[PDB]
Amino acid sequence: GLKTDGVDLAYMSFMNGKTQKSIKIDNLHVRTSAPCSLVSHHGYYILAQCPPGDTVTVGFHDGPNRHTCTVAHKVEFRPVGREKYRHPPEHGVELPCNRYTHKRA
Amino acid sequence: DLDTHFTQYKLARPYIADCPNCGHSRCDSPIAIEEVRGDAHAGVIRIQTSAMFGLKTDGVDLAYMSFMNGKTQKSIKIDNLHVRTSAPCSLVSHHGYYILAQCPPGDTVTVGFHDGPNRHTCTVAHKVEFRPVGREKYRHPPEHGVELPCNRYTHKRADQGHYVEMHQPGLVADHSLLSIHSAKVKITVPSGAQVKYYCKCPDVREGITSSDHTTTCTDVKQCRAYLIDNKKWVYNSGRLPRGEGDTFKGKLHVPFVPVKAKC
Amino acid sequence: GDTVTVGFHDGPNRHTCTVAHKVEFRPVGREKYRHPPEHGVELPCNRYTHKRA
Amino acid sequence: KAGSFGDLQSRTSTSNDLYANTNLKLQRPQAGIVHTPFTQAPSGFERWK
Amino acid sequence: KYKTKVPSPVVKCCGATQCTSKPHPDYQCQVFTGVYPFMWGGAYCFCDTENTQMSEAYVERSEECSIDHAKAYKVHTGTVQAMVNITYGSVSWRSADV
Numbered sequence: 001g002l003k004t005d006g007v008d009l010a011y012m013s014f015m016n017g018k019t020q021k022s023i024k025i026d027n028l029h030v031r032t033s034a035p036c037s038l039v040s041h042h043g044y045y046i047l048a049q050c051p052p053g054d055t056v057t058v059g060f061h062d063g064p065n066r067h068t069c070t071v072a073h074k075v076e077f078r079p080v081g082r083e084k085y086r087h088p089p090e091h092g093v094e095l096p097c098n099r100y101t102h103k104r105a
Numbered sequence: 106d107l108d109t110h111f112t113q114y115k116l117a118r119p120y121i122a123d124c125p126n127c128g129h130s131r132c133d134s135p136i137a138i139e140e141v142r143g144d145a146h147a148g149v150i151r152i153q154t155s156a157m158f159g160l161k162t163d164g165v166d167l168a169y170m171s172f173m174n175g176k177t178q179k180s181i182k183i184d185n186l187h188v189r190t191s192a193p194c195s196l197v198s199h200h201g202y203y204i205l206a207q208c209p210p211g212d213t214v215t216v217g218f219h220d221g222p223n224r225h226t227c228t229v230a231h232k233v234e235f236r237p238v239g240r241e242k243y244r245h246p247p248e249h250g251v252e253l254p255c256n257r258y259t260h261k262r263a264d265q266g267h268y269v270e271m272h273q274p275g276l277v278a279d280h281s282l283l284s285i286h287s288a289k290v291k292i293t294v295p296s297g298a299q300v301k302y303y304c305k306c307p308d309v310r311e312g313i314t315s316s317d318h319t320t321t322c323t324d325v326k327q328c329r330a331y332l333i334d335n336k337k338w339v340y341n342s343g344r345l346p347r348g349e350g351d352t353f354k355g356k357l358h359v360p361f362v363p364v365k366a367k368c
Numbered sequence: 369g370d371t372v373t374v375g376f377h378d379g380p381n382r383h384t385c386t387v388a389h390k391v392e393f394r395p396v397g398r399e400k401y402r403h404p405p406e407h408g409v410e411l412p413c414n415r416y417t418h419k420r421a
Numbered sequence: 422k423a424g425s426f427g428d429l430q431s432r433t434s435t436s437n438d439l440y441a442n443t444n445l446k447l448q449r450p451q452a453g454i455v456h457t458p459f460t461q462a463p464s465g466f467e468r469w470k
Numbered sequence: 471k472y473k474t475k476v477p478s479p480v481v482k483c484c485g486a487t488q489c490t491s492k493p494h495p496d497y498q499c500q501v502f503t504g505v506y507p508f509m510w511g512g513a514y515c516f517c518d519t520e521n522t523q524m525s526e527a528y529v530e531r532s533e534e535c536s537i538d539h540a541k542a543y544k545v546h547t548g549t550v551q552a553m554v555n556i557t558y559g560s561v562s563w564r565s566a567d568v
């Protein structure tokens with residue numbers, strides 16, 4: 001999110017040592033069965049558009065090292081509707097899905 | 106002989122359209138994916154980006170990369186293309202708007218390069234499979250086995266077996282034009298291009314001009330920021346607005362014909 | 369994965385290699401997962417080493 | 422019939438005329454964005470394979 | 471298999487654009503209003519309901535239609551053939567189509 005102090009959501013503070021490292025987000029990678037798409041980060045928390053996947057597999061690139069993290073979690077994406085797609089299309093009717101926001105406020 | 110299809114190259118531009126799930130949601134990517142064709146057998150898909158990679162703006166090196174940034178192209182290196190699906194695909198070849206890539210099956214298709222400052226990808230739904238031709242229902246082509254008459258797309262460009270209509274672009278929005286003349290909304294022009302202009306109020310009603318001002322209206326949000334810039338034709342994407350004037354010329358081939366390769 | 373697909377990056381070129389091979393990962397147990405969890409019981413699986421010696 | 426075999430029916434390959442009962446039904450694009458909803462049966466040549 | 475090779479829709483910004491039934495095979499075309507088409511600068515047509523969008527799509531033979539294509543026939547009886555070998559007698563050879 002912001003740095004240690006005050007600026008720019010699109011920077012990147014993890015812990016290296018006992019210490020933070022509040023620097024740029026350059027090469028984040030969430031992924032699953034396929035590489036996901038980031039949606040937004042705020043705080044400890046990231047939203048990302050993923051396909052289905054038996055697992056979840058996350059990781060940035062500090063620059064000297066890959067330094068990723070991975071986990072098990074059953075994932076699916078049924079769209080709301082009597083159609084059991086695997087993925088959202090470009091067209092079709094709109095109807096009341098459940099979904100997370102882009103925003104922070 | 107990469108210099109035999111200036112039909113497309115000189116005369117077509119990297120089109121920009123509305124990608125459906127462009128990382129976040131519906132952006133307008135230059136690599137907006139239309140006409141996914143998982144209809145062959147060889148692990149291959151022929152795709153059309155709205156972007157015209159290939160030679161540069163002018164004359165050199167298929168393996169460079171021209172998409173639209175702004176109203177403008179950006180004819181630079183292809184460095185980090187990524188087509189992908191359920192897994193990362195393998196590029197086969199690009200020519201014009203069009204790329205061939207060896208993919209596995211996938212519920213979707215998901216494309217993207219890396220300009221260098223940004224990921225800047227584009228993704229789409231399309232049912233993909235790869236049955237090989239044969240009474241064996243594999244999921245993937247092996248190293249060995251018999252050869253027999255599959256359907257498959259070529260590596261090459263020296264290709265005329267079909268041609269798709271590629272006439273002009275319609276206008277496009279560009280509100281970077283509509284600046285302010287310190288009290289009035291101020292339009293400009295790219296290079297003397299044809300800017301089609303008026304506002305909700307009564308002022309100049311067509312707009313075929315150099316940089317105009319706007320006597321009447323003030324707000325940028327009630328004016329016609331348009332670019333009739335038909336010096337280079339486009340692909341006739343469904344995600345194109347019609348060039349209302351005419352069906353201009355620009356019949357243009359397809360490289361990746363489906364051919365009777367023996368996979 | 370239906371296949372296996374390998375590759376490094378020399379730096380000027382991708383220069384990968386890919387192959388067919390039927391892959392699965394059943395964990396040992398009467399549970400037919402698709403992936404190893406963080407927790408659960410330990411029991412005698414078959415597996416390759418980290419090491420060289 | 423659309424979806425069924427022969428949704429596209431061209432006399433030959435050259436024949437510009439044909440019969441295309443595909444039940445192609447356009448729908449309006451969503452939320453003020455340029456695109457073309459074409460709602461259509463994938464071919465009776467897709468099935469039949 | 472078809473290819474819905476969509477011709478690029480018209481977008482009139484303030485008022486209607488009546489479509490006509492062009493002679494393309496299965497030329498489906500339907501006028502639409504009530505748009506606000508985001509195209510690279512947000513929307514571009516300054517109206518909000520008079521924004522009109524005319525979608526048109528016709529069916530066309532795939533490029534695979536030339537090469538990967540089923541093929542019907544009305545089949546009558548015709549006339550059967552054979553490359554009959556006779557290694558006759560002492561002649562010992564003829565392999566002829568009959």
Ligand SMILES: *[C@@H]1O[C@H](CO)[C@@H](O[C@@H]2O[C@H](CO)[C@@H](O[C@@H]3O[C@H](CO)[C@@H](O)[C@H](O)[C@H]3NC(C)=O)[C@H](O)[C@H]2NC(C)=O)[C@H](O)[C@H]1NC(C)=O
Nearest residue numbers: 552553554555556557558559561562563564565566567568
């Ligand atoms: C005529 O009737 C014959 C019925 O057996 C068949 O003709 C056969 O053609 C083969 C190829 O011309 C011959 O094989 C060759 O035979 C010689 C002599 O024995 C060998 O040196 C050769 O190696 C061998 N060729 C190979 C590739 O092995 C057969 O000998 C010959 N049959 C006989 C009895 O001599 C065919 O059914 C028919 N010919 C047609 C249809 O062309």
